[PDB]
Amino acid sequence: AKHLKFIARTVMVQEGNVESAYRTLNRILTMDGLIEDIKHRRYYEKPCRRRQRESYERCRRIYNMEMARKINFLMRKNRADPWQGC
Amino acid sequence: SNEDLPISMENPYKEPLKKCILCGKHVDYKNVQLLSQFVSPFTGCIYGRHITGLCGKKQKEITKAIKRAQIMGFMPVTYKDPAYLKDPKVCNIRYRE
Amino acid sequence: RQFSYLIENMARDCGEYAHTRYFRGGMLTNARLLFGPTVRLPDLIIFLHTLNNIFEPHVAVRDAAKMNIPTVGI
Amino acid sequence: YHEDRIRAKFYSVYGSGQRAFDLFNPNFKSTCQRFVEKYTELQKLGETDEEKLFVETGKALLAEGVILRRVG
Amino acid sequence: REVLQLQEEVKNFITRENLEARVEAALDSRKNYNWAITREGLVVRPQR
Amino acid sequence: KNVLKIRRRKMNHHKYRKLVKKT
Amino acid sequence: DPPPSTLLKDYQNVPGIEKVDDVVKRLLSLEMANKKEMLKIKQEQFMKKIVANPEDTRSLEARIIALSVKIRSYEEHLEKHRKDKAHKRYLLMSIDQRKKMLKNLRNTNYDVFEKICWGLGIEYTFPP
Amino acid sequence: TKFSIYPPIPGEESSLRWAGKKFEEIPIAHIKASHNNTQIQVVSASNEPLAFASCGTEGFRNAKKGTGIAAQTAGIAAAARAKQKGVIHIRVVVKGLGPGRLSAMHGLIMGGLEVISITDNTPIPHXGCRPRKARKL
Amino acid sequence: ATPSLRGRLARFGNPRKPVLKPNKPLILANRVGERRREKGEATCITEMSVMMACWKQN
Amino acid sequence: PRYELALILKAMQRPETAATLKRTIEALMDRGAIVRDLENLGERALPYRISAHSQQHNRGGYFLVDFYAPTAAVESMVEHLSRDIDVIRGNIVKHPLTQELKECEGIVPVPLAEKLYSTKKR
RNA sequence: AAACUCCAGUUGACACAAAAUAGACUACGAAAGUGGCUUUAACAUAUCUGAACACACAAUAGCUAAGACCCAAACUGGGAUUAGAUACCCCACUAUGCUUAGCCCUAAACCUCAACAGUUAAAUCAACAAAACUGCUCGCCAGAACACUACGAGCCACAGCUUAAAACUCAAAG
Ligand code: FES
Ligand SMILES: [K+]
Ligand SMILES: [K+]
Ligand SMILES: [K+]
Ligand SMILES: [Mg+2]
Ligand SMILES: [Mg+2]
Ligand SMILES: [Mg+2]
Ligand SMILES: [Mg+2]
Ligand SMILES: [Mg+2]
Ligand SMILES: [Mg+2]
Ligand SMILES: [Mg+2]
Ligand SMILES: [Mg+2]
Ligand SMILES: [Mg+2]
Ligand SMILES: [Mg+2]
Ligand SMILES: [Mg+2]
Ligand SMILES: [Mg+2]
Ligand SMILES: [Mg+2]
Ligand SMILES: [Mg+2]
Ligand SMILES: [Mg+2]
Ligand SMILES: [Mg+2]
């Protein structure tokens, strides 16, 4: 309301490529957390339920980031079996 | 006895501890150019430490300085001041890909 | 499996026996059913590698002790 | 070992030289080990300071023909 | 040492005698608190 | 654990409150 | 209360502070400091008036004086903040802690226990 | 020059022009993408209404308004009325995450308008009014 | 870097209240999840609209 | 103790800006303040539109006043600034240079937490 | 469907309401609790343990009195659904959530894991859960149900809270 307009969340279209511009805008809102925040704000999330979700989302980040670290660590070993026959 | 036995030392090859880009520097709420480097250019959202790369002490200092600068009439809230859009990029985030 | 061929040759050369393959359940504790009632079990078992391919002790280490067979192991 | 302190400083000042370690040869002497050996000899003379003793060691190797390119 | 430093600084403090002169001097001057950091941790002062 | 012990107490309290209101 | 012109406990013994400019003197006085700086002076005055060794801060005497200065600060805080339940708890706990210190001092050194009660105006009361 | 996704600042001097008009003078297409309806109003750079079209004004009723095709039809209708008044280039300002958030934009392009920028203005309270209670479904 | 797990769970040596309340032990399994099928959307809705709009005119 | 007054003044001509700055410094001194320095940060566009005293402001003159005052003076000065119609926004903060930043050795690494679950074979 | 059309969209002015991002941080407080900004005051104890009742606190709901009105919302009304629908779904609106001054003293107030001091060796260890233990102290528990009940007593509580049985019944309950 008080801020200047057409500066925040504004993306310029390149060569009339509106699809790519919209995808860029949607990716900016997703990475900053605005999209997921808007969906959670539609109905009131009670504090205990918010704490239960945040705890869930944090444990998933931990597990997922550790699994991914193990996948990248072991990927080199996907090479062909060097002792074929033993 | 023998002279070739291992002796007790502290790891002489130990590398110095890593320091964040703001280690040892004063974070002032008046310094809006610095503070703008840690907010989203599109939404004004403060970046987390996994993006800024700051230590816990400087992440708190930057956060508290931004919240002070914003309400005291020094910094915008909903976007990054366009004047600071060409400052050195120090945050590990890419929007275009 | 990098040394299965070497170990199997070394055993044949000295007139002994080698087991470098997947160790099937009961080779030692159920031998009389697997091989025959009059089969003679080894008197000594030498482990050149005591770990299986999931970095856990080779099952034969436990089964050798069950059968009271002395074991040498690197 | 005591020489680890010297080895650490040498690698920091000069870094691993282009000469590649040959670990198959049991008597291989790297440029760092040559420095350690010389440094240890100059310590027997009676020098009690690291800075001067360290600098003097580098000069001796340069006279012998060793290439010591500092990181700088 | 702190008392000595303070005794020097108080000589430049604004008083009721020099208030008007110091206000005019402030209106002429500019103080900039802005500086940017780089990925190498170096301060980039503003060029203006 | 199941909530069978809570359920017995839940009905006791509900019925008691309803009784107190009635009388 | 110590006058507002009283110099801070840190600058009271620096040589030549009696000759510095008036502006410097009020910048190093209690007037320009927070409430905690004036409590350090209250503690010092009680220590010099009561304790035999004003520099021993680990004796049961010095600890009763230090706690009594805190108790008074909580009572003054609560005179303005009558619904501050956190500080009301700190006051009541501190009063109980001082009573335990006074019971121990009375049991070990009665002569000094009398000087604590007179200097600080504490009336020892036996528990119910 | 490299393309800048960042919009031109109104105060600064820019070379980017659209039919001889600066970015600050291009008319604005305000899209309200709700969960059940899409409303499109094209206004001039001085806040003069030019065209309005919603899924309701196009004849869709009840749950049929909350569809991409309905929003696309409203976009085409708004573009037609705006193009009669002289609008070619529009700055889109979309509000909400409804089904017709993108479809309304396609309709505006299918209707002959050129979109030069997209701004999202979905209202996000920074702490605000407590929303309605969660639905038990 | 993975978020820290030090002092996050309710344990005998932890004085603070638990930060996390995992419903499953935070231990890596020996499997990953199956590849999720993509939920289908109605295709050819813009072209269908263009043809049906023309039918209405003609 | 030492404070910093961040004063955003209405965009005025030099004679009125000088009177307001004198007015403000005299109010500090009347409440027992020792004013140390006055810094001009320049006139700039405000980060957002600020409505003050029934006026909408888009520009202002930023100024800083470093001073010493008793703790009780802060509340009184805040009240005085509220009634001044030439001040867009005034905030008194504890001077940032009084606080001493502790020396930092650097980032101490924290390893993966261990022994969170018993070593029994589930 | 009802409802609204004194409606909706853009723009401007505009709270005694609530506090995106930071926070992938794990801090503060005795617990309850505490995450917008500023300032003031301010976070007991130089051995430890020590109370259903003493003393001081104690989420939410609730009570008394005076105010505040964005939004939410028990109850209630309307729409829909249904065999019925005193519900789940939609709309409207109140008590209530807020401030001030007094009450009430409850929670799955549970991290169901007491305070302080130590240990990782031995028999590690029923099972599961969050590995097994030592010293010391206070509190508490001795089949299920009756029973967060009856009676007595205390209480600003009066449809309340705290303390808390027995008879009959069963051979299980857990
Ligand atoms: S690592 Fe030193 S302050 Fe960040
Ligand atoms: K906030
Ligand atoms: K209880
Ligand atoms: K619990
Ligand atoms: Mg279950
Ligand atoms: Mg019953
Ligand atoms: Mg569970
Ligand atoms: Mg109708
Ligand atoms: Mg968050
Ligand atoms: Mg105790
Ligand atoms: Mg008792
Ligand atoms: Mg309560
Ligand atoms: Mg109430
Ligand atoms: Mg409402
Ligand atoms: Mg109401
Ligand atoms: Mg709780
Ligand atoms: Mg206890
Ligand atoms: Mg109860
Ligand atoms: Mg009862
Ligand atoms: Mg009774």
Side-chain angles (χ1 to χ4, degrees):
Chain A
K2 287 182 150 65
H3 288 95
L4 300 174
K5 295 180 179 178
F6 287 102
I7 297 169
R9 292 179 267 169
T10 302
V11 174
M12 300 295 296
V13 173
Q14 185 179 11
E15 304 170 359
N17 193 357
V18 173
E19 288 289 3
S20 70
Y22 181 83
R23 286 200 306 271
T24 299
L25 176 61
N26 192 15
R27 182 168 53 257
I28 295 172
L29 300 177
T30 303
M31 291 177 66
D32 286 353
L34 271 75
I35 293 307
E36 184 65 13
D37 185 43
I38 287 157
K39 293 165 167 190
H40 282 136
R41 275 180 191 282
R42 182 171 186 181
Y43 308 93
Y44 185 65
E45 186 166 23
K46 302 193 169 190
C48 59
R49 302 293 170 262
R50 179 171 177 93
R51 287 192 303 271
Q52 279 161 25
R53 177 173 59 82
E54 285 176 350
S55 178
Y56 165 80
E57 290 184 350
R58 275 166 185 148
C59 291
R60 176 164 57 87
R61 182 180 296 108
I62 288 179
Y63 185 97
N64 290 6
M65 282 189 68
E66 277 288 322
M67 179 54 79
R69 192 170 71 85
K70 179 163 187 172
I71 293 170
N72 298 317
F73 175 75
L74 294 178
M75 198 44 47
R76 65 195 312 126
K77 270 296 188 169
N78 196 48
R79 71 174 72 90
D81 165 30
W83 320 117
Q84 175 76 5
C86 293
Chain B
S1 67
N2 198 352
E3 66 182 359
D4 297 312
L5 280 190
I7 76 174
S8 297
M9 293 164 38
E10 293 179 354
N11 184 351
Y13 303 98
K14 204 180 155 193
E15 309 160 23
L17 287 185
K18 299 206 161 184
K19 285 180 162 200
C20 70
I21 54 173
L22 286 186
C23 189
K25 310 202 177 55
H26 174 69
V27 172
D28 212 334
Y29 71 96
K30 282 161 291 156
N31 184 357
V32 178
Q33 171 160 50
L34 173 67
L35 294 185
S36 292
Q37 284 177 286
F38 300 106
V39 308
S40 174
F42 301 102
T43 60
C45 283
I46 303 169
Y47 287 132
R49 63 197 60 203
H50 69 281
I51 296 161
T52 64
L54 296 177
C55 68
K57 189 187 81 189
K58 286 300 161 173
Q59 181 68 20
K60 182 63 67 167
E61 280 182 43
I62 290 284
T63 304
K64 298 292 293 196
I66 289 162
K67 294 304 296 176
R68 177 181 282 189
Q70 279 173 348
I71 193 65
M72 290 193 178
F74 284 77
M75 193 173 182
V77 185
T78 62
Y79 53 75
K80 192 158 156 165
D81 180 347
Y84 304 128
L85 275 182
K86 288 172 168 177
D87 294 342
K89 184 199 163 62
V90 292
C91 284
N92 320 318
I93 186 173
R94 293 182 183 174
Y95 283 120
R96 302 201 69 166
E97 293 177 350
Chain C
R1 304 170 55 252
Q2 177 174 10
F3 304 118
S4 165
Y5 186 71
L6 170 85
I7 293 171
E8 284 182 328
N9 276 322
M10 181 260 300
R12 197 197 51 248
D13 291 354
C14 60
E16 295 299 343
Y17 306 86
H19 188 275
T20 66
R21 310 296 182 155
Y22 172 81
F23 199 90
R24 283 156 65 215
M27 276 289 136
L28 287 169
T29 67
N30 202 23
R32 290 191 183 173
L33 192 56
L34 293 172
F35 297 110
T38 50
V39 71
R40 188 180 153 197
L41 280 190
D43 291 296
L44 175 63
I45 291 164
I46 305 178
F47 289 94
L48 284 153
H49 307 71
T50 61
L51 294 178
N52 63 28
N53 291 326
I54 61 158
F55 311 88
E56 291 176 19
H58 197 297
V59 61
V61 176
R62 184 196 78 211
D63 287 354
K66 285 184 175 291
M67 296 321 285
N68 293 253
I69 301 167
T71 50
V72 171
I74 312 296
Chain D
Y1 305 104
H2 279 291
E3 65 266 25
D4 290 324
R5 300 177 150 113
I6 310 165
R7 288 207 193 98
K9 178 158 181 201
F10 169 96
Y11 285 137
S12 72
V13 165
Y14 301 105
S16 177
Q18 315 159 337
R19 184 185 183 196
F21 286 76
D22 188 37
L23 306 178
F24 288 103
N25 170 24
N27 313 297
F28 176 86
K29 162 166 302 195
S30 52
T31 306
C32 185
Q33 180 55 23
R34 195 170 170 179
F35 187 109
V36 175
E37 289 292 348
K38 175 58 68 181
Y39 175 111
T40 299
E41 291 176 354
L42 296 185
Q43 184 173 358
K44 303 173 193 295
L45 299 189
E47 293 303 323
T48 62
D49 290 348
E50 174 183 10
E51 289 191 0
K52 183 176 178 179
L53 180 61
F54 180 79
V55 169
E56 289 182 338
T57 305
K59 294 178 182 172
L61 301 195
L62 292 187
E64 292 179 24
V66 175
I67 299 180
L68 296 176
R69 296 178 64 186
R70 294 183 183 175
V71 295
Chain E
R1 169 159 53 266
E2 283 170 11
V3 172
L4 285 162
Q5 167 177 11
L6 186 53
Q7 211 166 0
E8 296 157 21
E9 284 166 352
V10 175
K11 302 168 178 165
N12 308 322
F13 284 14
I14 303 182
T15 78
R16 284 195 188 268
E17 306 155 314
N18 66 20
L19 172 50
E20 291 179 351
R22 287 289 288 281
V23 164
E24 290 178 353
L27 282 170
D28 284 320
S29 189
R30 292 297 183 286
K31 164 69 180 171
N32 202 355
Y33 283 95
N34 286 32
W35 57 260
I37 201 69
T38 70
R39 292 180 168 282
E40 294 177 349
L42 302 183
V43 173
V44 182
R45 310 293 302 199
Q47 294 177 335
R48 295 178 183 175
Chain F
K1 62 187 285 199
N2 69 49
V3 296
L4 286 167
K5 284 168 187 166
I6 285 162
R7 278 179 53 77
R8 172 179 305 103
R9 280 182 34 106
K10 184 181 162 73
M11 184 50 66
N12 289 359
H13 188 73
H14 171 71
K15 282 165 77 160
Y16 179 67
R17 293 317 309 162
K18 279 198 60 174
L19 171 67
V20 165
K21 169 162 201 200
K22 181 177 178 180
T23 64
Chain G
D1 291 331
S5 50
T6 314
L7 284 176
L8 302 189
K9 184 176 178 181
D10 293 7
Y11 299 101
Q12 66 181 17
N13 298 320
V14 302
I17 195 149
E18 295 85 351
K19 299 291 180 68
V20 303
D21 182 24
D22 281 23
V23 172
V24 173
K25 289 190 291 187
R26 60 172 312 209
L27 285 175
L28 301 170
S29 68
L30 279 190
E31 184 178 1
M32 287 287 177
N34 67 13
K35 182 68 180 294
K36 269 160 191 94
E37 285 294 334
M38 180 267 275
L39 291 175
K40 287 167 43 165
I41 289 192
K42 278 194 176 213
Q43 192 170 326
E44 179 171 50
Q45 289 171 358
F46 277 133
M47 285 284 290
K48 283 167 179 175
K49 155 198 190 189
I50 303 168
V51 185
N53 186 17
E55 310 174 64
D56 192 20
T57 69
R58 285 215 55 208
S59 80
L60 195 48
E61 301 81 339
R63 287 164 50 219
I64 289 159
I65 287 163
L67 189 47
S68 303
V69 166
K70 277 188 184 170
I71 284 163
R72 179 56 195 156
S73 79
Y74 296 152
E75 288 171 331
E76 287 168 351
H77 171 94
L78 286 170
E79 179 163 15
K80 169 176 201 312
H81 306 282
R82 288 183 182 175
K83 300 190 82 157
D84 190 325
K85 302 307 184 175
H87 284 53
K88 180 174 194 176
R89 161 167 182 273
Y90 290 134
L91 174 56
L92 287 166
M93 281 193 309
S94 295
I95 287 164
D96 282 1
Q97 285 315 121
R98 186 177 64 184
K99 281 181 186 171
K100 186 189 297 193
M101 289 176 193
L102 280 162
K103 175 195 70 187
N104 290 326
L105 188 62
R106 185 185 173 268
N107 282 330
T108 54
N109 202 336
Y110 201 89
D111 283 311
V112 174
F113 162 78
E114 286 177 308
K115 202 180 177 202
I116 300 298
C117 285
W118 155 83
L120 299 171
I122 298 164
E123 185 176 5
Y124 185 81
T125 61
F126 296 86
Chain H
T1 58
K2 190 177 179 172
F3 184 81
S4 195
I5 57 177
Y6 299 109
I9 300 320
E12 311 176 16
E13 283 296 337
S14 189
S15 63
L16 304 179
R17 300 280 184 286
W18 301 260
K21 299 281 190 171
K22 308 200 286 202
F23 182 83
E24 303 78 49
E25 292 178 350
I26 305 299
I28 306 162
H30 295 280
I31 305 171
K32 191 176 191 292
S34 313
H35 300 291
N36 307 318
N37 198 18
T38 308
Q39 298 182 40
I40 312 164
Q41 196 183 190
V42 189
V43 306
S44 71
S46 64
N47 191 35
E48 298 177 350
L50 302 176
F52 182 88
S54 80
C55 304
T57 64
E58 297 322 300
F60 300 87
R61 293 278 166 281
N62 303 318
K64 288 55 165 160
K65 296 177 309 179
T67 61
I69 187 174
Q72 185 180 82
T73 307
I76 292 160
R81 292 201 268 288
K83 217 168 165 206
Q84 290 162 26
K85 287 214 182 183
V87 178
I88 295 170
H89 299 93
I90 46 164
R91 297 179 288 166
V92 168
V93 181
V94 65
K95 191 179 312 205
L97 297 184
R101 176 178 172 91
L102 181 54
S103 289
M105 185 180 288
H106 292 168
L108 285 164
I109 296 150
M110 286 162 67
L113 301 186
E114 317 189 14
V115 178
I116 78 170
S117 60
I118 317 168
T119 298
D120 173 46
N121 192 31
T122 315
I124 299 160
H126 298 172
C129 296
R130 171 187 185 120
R132 54 151 298 161
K133 79 191 177 143
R135 290 177 87 218
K136 293 181 181 180
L137 312 165
Chain I
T2 305
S4 179
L5 265 189
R6 180 173 51 87
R8 301 293 206 265
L9 303 178
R11 292 299 188 273
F12 279 135
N14 192 28
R16 63 188 62 87
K17 53 194 74 202
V19 167
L20 304 174
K21 293 173 175 172
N23 81 347
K24 288 168 305 277
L26 272 165
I27 301 174
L28 282 195
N30 298 350
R31 71 178 285 287
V32 291
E34 285 172 337
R35 181 177 65 83
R36 186 179 295 276
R37 90 188 291 166
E38 311 80 33
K39 153 176 181 172
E41 300 280 291
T43 47
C44 296
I45 305 288
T46 305
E47 296 73 6
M48 185 196 285
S49 180
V50 159
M51 167 185 72
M52 284 176 321
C54 201
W55 276 339
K56 262 299 188 167
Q57 292 156 29
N58 318 319
Chain J
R2 201 184 169 179
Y3 299 103
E4 195 173 57
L5 168 54
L7 199 66
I8 311 178
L9 289 189
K10 171 166 70 202
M12 303 168 284
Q13 311 308 322
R14 194 188 173 95
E16 292 83 3
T17 301
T20 307
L21 286 169
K22 191 194 186 183
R23 199 158 63 241
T24 308
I25 289 167
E26 283 178 324
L28 283 172
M29 287 172 175
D30 284 328
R31 285 162 181 75
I34 297 169
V35 178
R36 163 155 180 152
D37 196 21
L38 168 60
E39 283 170 315
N40 182 5
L41 314 194
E43 181 175 320
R44 42 163 286 198
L46 301 175
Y48 37 77
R49 190 178 332 116
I50 299 188
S51 67
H53 293 96
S54 85
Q55 326 285 299
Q56 326 296 319
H57 309 275
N58 292 113
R59 301 188 61 81
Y62 290 61
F63 292 96
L64 279 180
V65 185
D66 165 16
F67 67 97
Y68 292 92
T71 51
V74 181
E75 181 178 2
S76 179
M77 187 65 192
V78 159
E79 206 283 318
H80 163 94
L81 285 167
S82 314
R83 279 177 303 101
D84 187 338
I85 80 168
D86 270 349
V87 176
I88 299 179
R89 195 158 286 182
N91 295 288
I92 299 169
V93 294
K94 286 198 303 307
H95 198 273
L97 300 187
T98 61
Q99 295 177 335
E100 304 178 321
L101 296 205
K102 192 177 182 176
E103 293 178 351
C104 182
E105 294 177 318
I107 296 139
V108 298
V110 172
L112 178 67
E114 273 171 37
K115 304 177 300 175
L116 292 182
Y117 304 92
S118 171
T119 58
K120 70 173 183 172
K121 206 155 167 182
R122 302 150 168 72

